[PDB]
DNA sequence: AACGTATGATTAGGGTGTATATTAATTTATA
DNA sequence: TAAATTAATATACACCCTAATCATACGTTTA
DNA sequence: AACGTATGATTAGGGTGTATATTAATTTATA
DNA sequence: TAAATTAATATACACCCTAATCATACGTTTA
């Protein structure tokens, strides 16, 4: 049993035409939406063997995700899905594959879209990083002990290290006195000049 | 003639694999994107009878509306479109009648999604017919040439200069005591 | 009528002795504190002509400020105040004029004390400033436009001024362009080197 | 012999006025404080029979207990004490019986006030018989020699050094990323 | 018009104290 | 553990110092 | 013992995006 | 005034980059 479903788009307020359209494709019974509850009602009405007709994909849901649900539904209840606006929906519909086909493809595409958004986050991040990484921004860790250094205290330490170098102290002593690695002290040394 | 087209996603930098996968589907000749000009080149290369292969919808355009253009292009030049991840496309392929259909469908689905994502984040284009055709509403730019306080003006410029100089956002912000979000704003706006 | 008032100090818990002591000076009726409400009671009891006896100043209040109140009270109701611990206290109040006296002096002193704490604030402050002012710390206003300068933006401005100087632009133009005084620009000039 | 003693209060820097104000009461010889050593000097100068003049109680000591000492001293050496802002004292100094009395009284009043102000703010002296005669309670000094983290030790010292060098508190704080109160703590503790 | 140079006011960057509610680190009582 | 106890920190309130700047003005020299 | 010099791990100072509740500044509707 | 509307700011959440440092070890040279 052929079933239609219409719902006036706020940009396309005409109804009647839409209706006629539907019948023009066989719509025997037609639900009309005044949350879209009617829709659900219609979907519950149809069953294996019937054909559900609508003018355009978007009439199957307020957002893509929902469309998926809708289509899925029909797919399981094994109801033919027919969409008016599609050129040649007519000659093709008679193809043994087209149904299963159209249904799946729609789902796919759509899903391939959601998991594009669920990553819009990182994507733009990774996108930005890369751009930067190209500009030569990421430069590892900056000196932890040296003037300018973030933490003012380390600045103090840095200086004392130096002072202790001019004072001619011994590396080992410097290290222990400032709780630093020898290597590090050396770095401060061959760095000072 | 089977033709592939690859372009490394910033999140998926591997290339080689992508390549092989293309060949795995028949790609004889393969164009690689290093604006996406290569793409346009590949599209011009193909012609009635060939098959254009790609890994995923998005490789056909930076934004959906471009994809539409792409797909539409192929549809008219009558080139088979094949997407590595919507494998079933394989079937219908080879029956000139159904091929159109797919494209046609692919289009509608996308064209639709182009709203559900376009009617959500509403806009630096309304500042060319409201501020360039009258007087703009809301607070005025604090940092930009013209700006009331001359010093801000100076700052604005330095921000820019530092952008061309390719400096990092964070550094700019701190150097000018501004928010990143603001520097951003100065960025998008410059153009 | 001679009236005494006792209240055991937590450091001096003996009572009885204190009592005797009071009587030893004439206490006919004696109030004993077990907020110090009894005290207020006793104070209300006395009247012009009576003598209020206590062992020590502090028995007149929980803090100096209160003692003042107490004493002031007695002074107005014209009640003789006597304090035991004072050497020659009798020899003293055996004169009628040494009453007015003691009362006033106490008040004075005490007041001259509160008005010492009332300023303990500014005192230590002014005290500290001075020390510093001596150490040569206070150094006026530091440069507003120059590298290092507090506000990063002005730092930016400073530089641009310079740049515009090397670029050989004119003072006046610099000034207007950076919303600064000529004098100031000159300062930046006659400074750079 | 009438003797005065002046010392400019940091809140009342005028000197000269204070001086005359002393002479206005008879001050023949006047000692001026530039620890208060002059004061002690003046006190040693006076002899039974003389009168010691000062503007206000507080000029007799840095803290109350010292005043007591001062007053007591004068009381024994039998020197008249006369305080400028408690003018009514003049009415009586003549007679030595009322003189003692006043002092005696002045003492009690003060001795008293010495509690109402001593039993309120409850101490860097209990760290010489608890931490220098056992083990100290509470958190350990974070900045001080001995301190666990060696770097902290280094900082501590620099704070000190900067104190002797006579630097300003605020600067010290910022330079060592410490709180002012903390720097204070290091100050009072040093000695 | 810019430049060069003054002069009295206002000022922003720096200072001096004090005090309280929190969050550390330790030793020392319970349960 | 759960106290008890003392160090730091984070914040506020209150108000002090003083050379840079600002606002101004006024001859003189460059455009 | 220090010095001189390596080598693999961990890391702290720097980065990249995004998003929300507030507090600015303006123009533009009311009442 | 009271909206309405757009700029900045102040903060958080999420997670990426990478040369200094740390921890280590191991011959060699100074005390």
Numbering used by the authors:
A (entry chain E), C (entry chain C): 1 to 34, 42 to 200
B (entry chain F), D (entry chain D): 1 to 34, 42 to 129, 132 to 200
Question: Anything the authors wrote about it?
Answer:
It is thought to stabilize plasmids by resolving dimers into monomers. Synapsis of the regulatory Sin dimers at site II is thought to initiate assembly of the synaptic complex, leading to formation of an active catalytic tetramer at site I (Rowland et al., 2002).
To address these issues, we have solved the crystal structure of a wild-type (WT) Sin dimer bound to a site II duplex. WT Sin was cocrystallized with a 29 bp DNA duplex containing the site II direct repeat (Rowland et al., 2002). Each Sin monomer is composed of a mixed αβ N-terminal catalytic domain and a helix-turn-helix (HTH) CTD that are linked through an extended helix (helix E), which forms the majority of the dimerization interface. Sin bound to site II is catalytically inactive. The catalytic serines are >12 Å from the DNA and are partially blocked from it by the E helix of the other monomer. The second potential tetramer interface buries substantially more surface area (1865 Å2) and is composed entirely of contacts between the DNA-binding domains (CTDs), primarily the N-terminal portions of each helix F. The Sin tetramer defined by this interface places the binding domains and associated DNA duplexes near the center of the complex with the catalytic domains on the outside. The duplexes cross each other at a ∼60° angle to form a negative node and are <10 Å apart.
